[PDB]
Design a protein around this ligand. Structure first.
Ligand SMILES: *[C@H]1O[C@H](CO)[C@@H](O[C@@H]2O[C@H](CO)[C@@H](O)[C@H](O)[C@H]2NC(C)=O)[C@H](O)[C@H]1NC(C)=O
Ligand SMILES: *[C@H]1O[C@H](CO)[C@@H](O)[C@H](O)[C@H]1NC(C)=O
Ligand SMILES: *[C@H]1O[C@H](CO)[C@@H](O)[C@H](O)[C@H]1NC(C)=O
Length: 279
C-alpha cells in the first residue's frame, strides 16, 4: 500500500533552490534510490528558481510559511502524513510549519544544521578574537529589529540578541513567535508534540552558524555573548513552553553530531543515519 513509502517534503537553505542537481537535486536522488517509489516534494518558493533563491534572502518568512502550508494542503499524496527535512534555515522553517499548520500532519522532522534559537554572529567572523567582528554584530541589534528591516530581511527574522534580549522578544516577527517569547501559544506546543521524531543534526566543526549550539536548540546564556547553555538548562525547557521537555522524556528528540563544517556530509553517513528516519 502507499503507507510504507511516506512522502518526504524538503526545504532548501539560504542561497540555494529546490532543484539544483548538485545539492537538493542530489538529495532527492539518493532518497529515491534507497526507498523505491517514494514521492519527494522539494519546495520552491516562487514561480522561478530566480525568485526562489532570492526569496531566501528577501521574502517575509511568515509569508513563506503560509504559502508552503497552502502547497502541502493541495497535494493529495500527503494527506495521510509526511516526513520533512530542512537544510540550514530550512530547519526552523519546517519547524514553523509543524506548529502553524497541523494538516496535513508532519510525522518525523529532520533538521540538518538548523538554527532553532537563531544566530548572533556573522559567518567565519568569531567575535572572541576580533574587535571588528564583535563590533558589527553588536552594532546591528541596534537596527535588526526595526519593523522595516524585519519585514524585508529573512536573516533578520531569526537574529537573536542575548544581550538586549528584551527587544528581541518584543520585536522579532518570526523566531520570537515560534519560540513562545511573547506568550505561550497553546496550539504551537500541541502541534510540535504531535511529531513522532524531531532529529537535530549538528556539525561539530561548523564555522557558519554562530553559536553552533543553536543546532541542538541551545544558545548563549542570557545577558552576554561569550558562554552558551544547552536546551535542558533554558527556561523554554524548564517551563516546557513548547513541549520539548515532554518530548525528551518520551524519546521524541534525537541529537546527532558529526565532524565537518556547515552542511558537510557524505553519502555513507546520510545512508546510515538519515535514511532510517524516512523509511
Ligand atoms: C573540528 O571541530 C570540531 C568542533 O570545533 C571538533 O570537535 C570537538 O570540538 C570541541 C570544541 O572545540 C573540542 O573540545 C573536542 O575535543 C572536539 N572533538 C575532538 C574529539 O577533538 C573536532 O575535533 C575538530 N576536528 C577536525 C575535523 O578538525
Ligand atoms: C516590550 O513589551 C513589554 C510588554 O510587557 C514591555 O513591558 C517592555 O518594556 C518592552 N521591551 C522593550 C524594551 O521594548
Ligand atoms: C496557538 O495558541 C492558541 C491556540 O491554542 C491561539 O491563541 C494562538 O493564536 C495560536 N497561534 C497561532 C497564531 O496559530
Amino acid at each position: 500500500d502507499p503507507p510504507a513509502p511516506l512522502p518526504l517534503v524538503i526545504w532548501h537553505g539560504m542561497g540555494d533552490s529546490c532543484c539544483n542537481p548538485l545539492s537538493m537535486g542530489a538529495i532527492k536522488k539518493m532518497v529515491e534510490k534507497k526507498i523505491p517509489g517514494i514521492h519527494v516534494l522539494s519546495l520552491e518558493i516562487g514561480k522561478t528558481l530566480r525568485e526562489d533563491v532570492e526569496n531566501s534572502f528577501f521574502l517575509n518568512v511568515n509569508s513563506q510559511v503560509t504559502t508552503v502550508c497552502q502547497i502541502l494542503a493541495k497535494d493529495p499524496k500527503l494527506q495521510q502524513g509526511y516526513n520533512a527535512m530542512g537544510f540550514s534555515q530550512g530547519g526552523q522553517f519546517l519547524r514553523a510549519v509543524a506548529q502553524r499548520c497541523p494538516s496535513p500532519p508532519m510525522v518525523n522532522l529532520i533538521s540538518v544544521g538548523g538554527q532553532h534559537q537563531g544566530v548572533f554572529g556573522l559567518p567565519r567572523c568569531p567575535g572572541e578574537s576580533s574587535h571588528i567582528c564583535d563590533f558589527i554584530r553588536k552594532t546591528l541589534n541596534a537596527g535588526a529589529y526595526n519593523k522595516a528591516i524585519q519585514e524585508r530581511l529573512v536573516q533578520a527574522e531569526y537574529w537573536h540578541d542575548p544581550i538586549r534580549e528584551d527587544i528581541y522578544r518584543n520585536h522579532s516577527i518570526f523566531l520570537a513567535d515560534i519560540n513562545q517569547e511573547r506568550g505561550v501559544n497553546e496550539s504551537y506546543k500541541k502541534n510540535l508534540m504531535a511529531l513522532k521524531k524531531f532529529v537535530m543534526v549538528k556539525f561539530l566543526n561548523d564555522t557558519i552558524v554562530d553559536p553552533v549550539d543553536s543546532e541542538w536548540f541551545g544558545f548563549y546564556r542570557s545577558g552576554q555573548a561569550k558562554e552558551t547553555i544547552p536546551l535542558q538548562e533554558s527556561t523554554l525547557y524548564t517551563q516546557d513552553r513548547l513541549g520539548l521537555k515532554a518530548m525528551d522524556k518520551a524519546g521524541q528528540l534525537v541529537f546527532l553530531a558529526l565532524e565537518g563544517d556547515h552542511l558537510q556530509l557524505s553519502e555513507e553517513w546520510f545512508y546510515a543515519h538519515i535514511i532510517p528516519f524516512l523509511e
